Amino acid sequence: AEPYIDPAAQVHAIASIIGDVRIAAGVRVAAGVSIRADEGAPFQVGKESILQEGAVIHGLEYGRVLGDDQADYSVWIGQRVAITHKALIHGPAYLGDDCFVGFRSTVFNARVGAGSVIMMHALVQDVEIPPGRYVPSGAIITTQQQADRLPEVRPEDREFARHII
Amino acid sequence: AEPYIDPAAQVHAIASIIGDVRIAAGVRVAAGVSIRADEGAPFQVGKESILQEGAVIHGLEYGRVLGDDQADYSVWIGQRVAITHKALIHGPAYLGDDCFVGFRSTVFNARVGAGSVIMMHALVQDVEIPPGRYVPSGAIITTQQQADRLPEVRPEDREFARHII
Amino acid sequence: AEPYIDPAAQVHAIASIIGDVRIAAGVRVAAGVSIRADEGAPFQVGKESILQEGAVIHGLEYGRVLGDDQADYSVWIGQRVAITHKALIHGPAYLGDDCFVGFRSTVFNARVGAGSVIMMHALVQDVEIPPGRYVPSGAIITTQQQADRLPEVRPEDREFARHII
Ligand SMILES: [Cl-]
Ligand code: NI
Ligand code: NI
Ligand code: NI
């Protein structure tokens, strides 16, 4: 009912975190981020993840994903996940460790494998993305056939992700 | 100049409603919704409509649509209309009863027929959508030729809309 | 470290401007605009530019553009630039005089020539757009080959831009 905010987390005074949200050590939350586990709960945000301005994390009352701890979540965000300007993560949703979600991109009703890079103005809905895939800018990924055909992340893509954060 | 808020409406303390806005019985407005009839006015929001976080309703000084009461509006939102996360309704705009507007979708200078379902990351501009049409995720509908060719809403699409709200 | 706000600028009480931002005479900034030169700085916003609700101006710590004064900026916005609802300008970025950026459009790591019209739901990234080009609604411009092939702005496009502001 109250968020658990790790003492080593850095949450902006003007960020809004409500309900059963667990924020791990080293997570950075910018001003004008909204995390509300008032419908769908609980939410996990793993160590050293980064949420930038305009990011929103919400969830449906019904629908859960399996966390790495074998517990059920509305939203599971792994370690070192980057959720950039204006991104929307809407439960049920799973982002594995080292994922990047680019500006104005949406993840809804989906599981995103570790080390994936989702670029700008993209939608990922109703699918499982395998680990280490690249979603190009402007992509509209709404079927498992599209998700299974995504190309692999290259070193240059991770380098890009690190520069943006 | 002052909004009319029906006593049976449920408006969040942190929602911002300004100018000649009429909010009917049973309308739910989330925190971080902005409705400003400070340029284009008036706005009607019909019974049991739902506005989710990030939604914005604004309007141009000039340009109106015919409401169901035969009066002129910058924005007419019918009954049981769902305006979901980050949607932008910009007058002149008409949404008929039982319309759904999905995450990050925009309706501008357009009339949307009753019982239409507009999915995620879509734009509807400068057109009339006939009653009961479906606008797929990522669609960019900017001509009357595109609007006239949209497919019909299926029962599964309305079921989807009800689950999201 | 403190913004310079020209006494002839009109900034909403609820707009958030932070760090080394220079706002020129006649600039209008709406409520719920965010301009933060807390990572990338400095930002210039030229005379009689307009920023509408939901607009965000931010910048990367590293990466600059050449301003018209031959000084380096994270973000250079020229004179009479229109940055409309939910647009994201992310440094390093240059917008020349008389540019229009339509609803929910993004300019990142790019130079946009004077008198260009970028329409709704568009992305402009990693490119130089020549002066006086048109970017259609929904366009995803991520390569210099795409930017070099854009059509010219017509009089009707500027007329459209003036009507929106
Ligand atoms: Cl958006
Ligand atoms: Ni929600
Ligand atoms: Ni407006
Ligand atoms: Ni930024």
Numbering used by the authors:
A (entry chain A), B (entry chain A), C (entry chain A): 16 to 180
The authors write:
The asymmetric unit of the crystal contained the protomer of γCAL181, while γCAL exists as a trimer in solution. Indeed, analysis using proteins, interfaces, structures and assemblies (PISA)48 indicated an extensive interface between subunits (4,180 Å2 buried at the interface from a total accessible surface of 18,860 Å2). Note that γCAL198 and γCAL181 are nevertheless trimeric in solution, suggesting that the head-to-head association occurs only at high protein concentrations within the condensate or crystal. To investigate the functional relevance of this interaction, we disrupted the salt bridges by either mutating R164 to aspartate or D172 to lysine. Strikingly, both R164D and D172K mutants strongly reduced homodemixing of M58, indicating that dimer-of-trimer formation via the γCAL domains provides critical valency, presumably by increasing the local concentration of SSUL modules.
β-Carboxysome biogenesis is reliant on the protein CcmM as a central organizing scaffold. The full-length CcmM protein in Synechococcus elongatus PCC 7942 (Se7942) is a homotrimer of ~58-kDa subunits (SeM58). The N terminus of each M58 protomer consists of a γ-class carbonic anhydrase-like (γCAL) domain that has lost the functional motifs for CA activity, followed by three Rubisco small subunit-like (SSUL) modules connected by flexible linkers.
